[PDB]
Design a binder for this molecule. Structure first.
Ligand SMILES: CCc1ncc(C)c2nc(CCc3nc(N4CCCC4)nn3C)nn12
Ligand SMILES: [Mg+2]
Ligand SMILES: [Zn+2]
Length: 313
């Protein structure tokens, strides 16, 4: 009730910045998350006992894969926190509650494989969920954990507030399917420019929350260069394992997933910043001016990938 979470001074300060790294101390990650909910949402959003038990069940249902792990979940939630704190007055009480939870839960029980590989392997999830296969799974795992005895952190919301929050979380999690992102950003691009973007239109909020989700999910490209470069090693460690598995099914993987194209990583990173990252943070900054530090950090890391291609590092 009177029990604030504090962080050591360097974290207490650096956690407010977009580029904050949550560090290698796994055991501090829960407290970092609780700290961020408490400042973002207030100390009264969740019963602490329930929140702690929910965080620990979420943790247990992330797998020890090189990239889509518990560290990624808490990274994507810290970026959402940064966005929320810098756009204080644009979001509802329920949106602040829901989105930090959505981000912690967005990759629950990920196996290190793309929706594509699940479809070619003919994994059972691919017959339960024909598109956004893993993302429909992540949402389903969220609801499961919320239904555990003692884990309903939303148990004080009205019957209809509860339904609104689970609907924000579902759309938020589905929007992390990067196949949906391209169309979502194109439509936001058009509506912003033609002046039709309206934050009272619920379907517009949805789009804008979807772009925030993609921005948070891609936030490794917005870190200090050494964080960005070492996270790319984890990202390709999964992709290349998937490439291996594709070759086991008799299928040439795409170059992104072929470890025989190690040499081309720098140029693949350029494609990705140009096709995906920069456009994402550009459109995000237009709609939400105070997120510009994500665009500016992303541009910095593109320029570092340019330097790598030129032998300069
Ligand atoms: C959400 C996906 C994602 N989030 C963050 C990051 C940093 C990220 N990087 C990549 C791979 C990008 C890429 N690599 C290649 N290569 C490598 C050598 C030949 C082809 N092609 N492409 C397009 N995805 N990704
Ligand atoms: Mg995902
Ligand atoms: Zn993710």
């Amino acid at each position: 009730g009177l029990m604030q979470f504090t962080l050591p001074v360097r974290l207490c300060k650096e956690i407010e910045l977009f580029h904050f790294d949550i560090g290698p101390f796994e055991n501090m990650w829960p407290g970092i998350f609780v700290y961020m909910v408490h400042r973002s949402c207030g100390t009264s959003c969740f019963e602490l006992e329930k929140l702690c038990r929910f965080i620990m069940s979420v943790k247990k249902n992330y797998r020890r894969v090189p990239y889509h792990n518990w560290k990624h979940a808490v990274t994507v939630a810290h970026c959402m926190y940064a966005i929320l704190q810098n756009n204080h007055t644009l979001f509802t009480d329920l949106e602040r509650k829901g989105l930090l939870i959505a981000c912690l839960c967005h990759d629950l029980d990920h196996r290190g494989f793309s929706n594509s590989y699940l479809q070619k392997f003919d994994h059972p999830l691919a017959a339960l969920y024909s598109t956004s296969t893993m993302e429909q799974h992540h949402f389903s795992q969220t609801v499961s954990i919320l239904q555990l005895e003692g884990h309903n952190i939303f148990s004080t919301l009205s019957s209809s507030e509860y339904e609104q929050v689970l609907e924000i979380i579902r759309k938020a999690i589905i929007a992390t399917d990067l196949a949906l992102y391209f169309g979502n950003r194109k439509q936001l691009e058009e509506m912003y420019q033609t002046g039709s973007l309206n934050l009272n239109n619920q379907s517009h909020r949805d789009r804008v929350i979807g772009l925030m989700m993609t921005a948070c999910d891609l936030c490794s490209v917005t870190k200090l260069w050494p964080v960005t470069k070492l996270t790319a090693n984890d990202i390709y460690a999964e992709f290349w394992a998937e490439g291996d598995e594709m070759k086991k099914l008799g299928i040439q993987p795409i170059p992104m997933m072929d470890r025989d194209k190690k040499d081309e990583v720098p140029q693949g990173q350029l494609g990705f910043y140009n096709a995906v990252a920069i456009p994402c943070y550009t459109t995000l900054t237009q709609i939400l001016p105070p997120t510009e530090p994500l665009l500016k950090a992303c541009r910095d890391n593109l320029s570092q990938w340019e330097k790598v291609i030129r032998g300069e590092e």
